[PDB]
Amino acid sequence: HQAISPRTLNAWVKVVEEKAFSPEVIPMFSALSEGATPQDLNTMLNTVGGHQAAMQMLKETINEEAAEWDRVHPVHAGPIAPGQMREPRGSDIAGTTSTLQEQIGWMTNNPPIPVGEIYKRWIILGLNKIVRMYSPTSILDIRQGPKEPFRDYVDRFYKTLRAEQASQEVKNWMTETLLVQNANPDCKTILKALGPAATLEEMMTACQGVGGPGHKARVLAEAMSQVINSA
Amino acid sequence: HQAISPRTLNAWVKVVEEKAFSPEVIPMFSALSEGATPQDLNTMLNTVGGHQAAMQMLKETINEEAAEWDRVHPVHAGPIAPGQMREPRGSDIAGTTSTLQEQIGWMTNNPPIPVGEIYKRWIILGLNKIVRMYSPTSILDIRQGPKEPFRDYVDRFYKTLRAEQASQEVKNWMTETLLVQNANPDCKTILKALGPAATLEEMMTACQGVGGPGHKARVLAEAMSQVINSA
Amino acid sequence: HQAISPRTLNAWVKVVEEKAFSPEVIPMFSALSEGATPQDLNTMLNTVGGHQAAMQMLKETINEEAAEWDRVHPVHAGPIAPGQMREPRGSDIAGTTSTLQEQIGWMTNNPPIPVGEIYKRWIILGLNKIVRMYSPTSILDIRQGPKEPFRDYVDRFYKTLRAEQASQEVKNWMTETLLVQNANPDCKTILKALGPAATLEEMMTACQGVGGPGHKARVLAEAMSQVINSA
Amino acid sequence: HQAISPRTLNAWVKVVEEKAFSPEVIPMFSALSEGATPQDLNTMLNTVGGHQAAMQMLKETINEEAAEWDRVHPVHAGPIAPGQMREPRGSDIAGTTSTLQEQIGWMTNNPPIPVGEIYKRWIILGLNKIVRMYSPTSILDIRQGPKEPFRDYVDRFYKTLRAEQASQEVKNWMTETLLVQNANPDCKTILKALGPAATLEEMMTACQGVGGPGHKARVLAEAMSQVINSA
Amino acid sequence: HQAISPRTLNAWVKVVEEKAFSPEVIPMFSALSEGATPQDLNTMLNTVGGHQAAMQMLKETINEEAAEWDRVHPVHAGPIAPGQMREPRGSDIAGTTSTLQEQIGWMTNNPPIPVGEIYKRWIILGLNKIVRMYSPTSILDIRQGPKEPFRDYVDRFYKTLRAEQASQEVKNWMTETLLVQNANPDCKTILKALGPAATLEEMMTACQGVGGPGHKARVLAEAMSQVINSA
Ligand SMILES: O=P(O)(O)O[C@H]1[C@H](OP(=O)(O)O)[C@@H](OP(=O)(O)O)[C@H](OP(=O)(O)O)[C@@H](OP(=O)(O)O)[C@H]1OP(=O)(O)O
């Protein structure tokens, strides 16, 4: 038995966190899981932080693969044998309903049953599906909607920034730069009307009125003022 | 067995209520629960008042750690009569399906199984996740939305006040200082138009028409008249 | 032997990377290494990515502590074969010249020798020294010197960016918003006159002459012309 | 023993030279070394031409992995002569202190010790580190410093060209189109005034005085004359 | 054996940290180490924090004294097993190659060998040399060089402040009242023009160009304009 080492698992986690789910994660995984048991592969998968939608898609793909294996490979009545090794099922290959001893026995039996390799193939199918379909979210993509309240936008921005992979200084710089930048024009003009030294609460109070009756009437009157004056 | 004392439990409760879930709770916990059985740790956790979201995240982390323990650690189906002590499961370490005597036996038998230490590590992981992800709400954060009715804002304000950790006089001071200050400009203009001695019912009646047809027509007409008289 | 779990080790790594070496790492380490062997502690220390200066200072502190332990504690001349084990030394406590079985034997023998606890104390002393003395480097701190060539500053910036913990999109935004901003005034004037659409190669070509005879003559002539025109 | 074929090894060398150390080298390496002994992997690594810094980082990563393997895996005191082989160490897995026969015995014995697979994992970790941190040098990146003498820049350019992978005609075209282009403005002015037919010796003679007292005085006088004539 | 008490050792540490290495440390040391073994003397010396240069000079003096003792005192060839002990050497007196039991036996045997007294004399000679030749560094002595970049001076200032023995509030006050004051005139002019409310990053940005072509040209132009206007 050669269980996955802390350095290898950490390298896998850093690869996933640095490349998000770019295609380059597919080779790295295959390179960091050679000879791995299904338990080691499950440890690799469960240690990933974030990307909950991607892991959900991966779990769905693994479940479909296990169901297909169960369909194609029938169960046996289970007669006793001198070796008495039960035939693995989809859950056994996925490691959900099997122990490390059972996986090792299957992998080192004669003839061998490479449950680890089948599970790797399932995980690679899921990873390819993730690469095709999943697009990671970023603090750079958090923009205020045309009618979204400024408080809701600030809450979304801070929720995304809390899960962002960056240092605290970088996160403070992101707050100083992108929050006002990615606001909608109605709130952005008010924010620019305020000084650059305004604290968060002052911006919240300033934009608390955007989309209300008073602000709507004020902007409508300001727009009509130009057309009246030009006439 | 030195169970947790009422003084230590009370001190933990005050630490949680005073520092919300700032990083400072992690040392205090580690200092107030050394040598504690999983039952004592559960008693410490369940005594926390409020912070239901943080408690939910902590429970999710604890369940994840227990599931990972169950996955990695196999369960033997053969009972042994000499030294009859079952191997703890994840829920047994978490104290959900284990008794105090069983936890003491695990913490005392040779070789020791530090169920309390493992549970404490799981709780610390959950607390670190809470510190990273959880932001407690305060009465200072209850602001009226631009399109939110004043009655709904008042209901939210009083619901948050009822859960605020403060004395009654402080709560009345917050009611008299923050309810009008943290309202949207459309309602705040009407509230300032009313006298400072206006009651809650008068304040609600005055703002009952904000966002309605009459109030919107009135503000639009006021803005139009201002810009027309400017010309 | 309750060896450190993959999730605990990964959580330690993320704590170190997220908090750099702020004091908050000290409570986490103590909470994540309770009951750990010197081998486990060395595994936690060796898995830290980056912060080479901090790890060097930690290793120096550990070496001083081991040397002091060796100075205070003398060796024994005659080994006791029956029912006795070798007395640990500084390197044995630090795990450099010790095996996991020997460490477990020391912690399990009566009377116990808490080699893990002594090593934890040494590591905490080193971590406190790091917190006092070490300041991490950031991409935000990379600024062009008054006389530094623009190529050298760009090389330093890109090295720090490659070492930075961030997503690729965030790194691209960092390059787009930090490289020109943190340049010196002599290069910043040319970069701003070049336009926002300029590429990196165009920017380096435009600043290739800053500090050369022609650039110095040109800026001196501009200043002289201004002061003569004022006269 | 399926030793690496000359065509496979040459294809690996061409992959490394063509792609530098882009991520694409990782899938190819794993594809070209599957089933390889540590000796074959060492032959693959040692045949790489150039990229001395990248090979140094790879060797450092391999050394760290071997040291960690030695730390985790203790040695055995008493050798077993009948029907047993020496347990591999970090250097044995890396192939530094191991022979091909011992490697084949390890990957063939029951239970197998996949020394080739472990060494492949270490090399893949090093390659990932290279991909993250290493940027290859190119003749296109050789530029004259603002105060660098033209002779030194020409020497650097010709050294890089000698190290460049290109045909002799292509290298001549690079000399004819890149040396003058990537010179600093002070030298570029003189080179352009010299004419396209100027030889290398003529260009180096013409720029021999850039940065000297006479050249600086002349350029300062030209700028001063321009600004005085404007007045 | 009257080993040095924790209060005595801590008092010695406070004496060194308060008086730096003024002559006053010599009477205190002799008063705080009377009757001490070489081990206690080494514990007193090694616990001193900071003053690395002074400790280096002290160790050099101790090594010189040990070498002179070894030169003057020859070794003995034939050991005397019954009723005799090894004759101390220079390193034995210094405690480097001696154990506490041997030191006590030397200071107790008849005739006594005052290894503690000899080592005290050596340490006193080293301390006298330190008082004569060593001057401690202070945050008050950190000044910007006439040509030193402002960033380098800020880095030196913050390193010295981190190494300074003061409270955090005192360190903040030192930063607020010493950084600008001890800057060179070229940077001080810009810092004063920036205003007292300027932040550290703003101050570094404002002084990023001092010593560059533009700043030199501008100051030369200002001086030239002044003298021309006088004419
Ligand atoms: O606030 P209400 O009195 O109930 O009227 C609203 C309002 O239209 P007006 O302010 O022009 O009267 C909305 O404007 P927004 O707040 O969304 O900007 C509009 O929504 P849209 O202009 O975006 O479509 C919506 O619907 P609609 O104009 O289609 O009628 C309309 O609702 P009602 O007049 O039906 O109540």
Swiss-Prot record, chains A, B, C, D, E:
Changing I80A: 1.2-fold decrease of PPIA-binding affinity. It is found in: Virion. Forms the conical core that encapsulates the genomic RNA-nucleocapsid complex in the virion. Most core are conical, with only 7% tubular. The core is constituted by capsid protein hexamer subunits. The core is disassembled soon after virion entry. The capsid promotes immune invasion by cloaking viral DNA from CGAS detection. Host restriction factors such as host TRIM5-alpha or TRIMCyp bind retroviral capsids and cause premature capsid disassembly, leading to blocks in reverse transcription. Capsid restriction by TRIM5 is one of the factors which restricts HIV-1 to the human species. The chain holds residues 144 to 374 of 500 of the full protein. The lineage of its organism: Viruses, Riboviria, Pararnavirae, Artverviricota, Revtraviricetes. The modification Phosphoserine is found at S5. Residues 134-220 are annotated as: Dimerization/Multimerization of capsid protein p24. Residues 46-84 are annotated as: Interaction with host PPIA/CYPA and NUP153. Homodimer; the homodimer further multimerizes as homohexamers or homopentamers. Interacts with host NUP98. Interacts with host PPIA/CYPA; this interaction stabilizes the capsid. Interacts with host NUP153. Interacts with host PDZD8; this interaction stabilizes the capsid. Interacts with host TRIM5; this interaction destabilizes the capsid. Interacts with host CPSF6. Interacts with host NONO; the interaction is weak. This is Capsid protein p24. Changing G78V: 154-fold decrease of PPIA-binding affinity. Changing A77G: 44-fold decrease of PPIA-binding affinity. Phosphorylated possibly by host MAPK1; this phosphorylation is necessary for Pin1-mediated virion uncoating. It comes from the Viruses. Residues 74-82 are annotated as: PPIA/CYPA-binding loop. Changing Q39Y: Increased interaction with human NONO. The record marks L220, A221 as: Cleavage. Changing I80V: 1.0-fold decrease of PPIA-binding affinity.
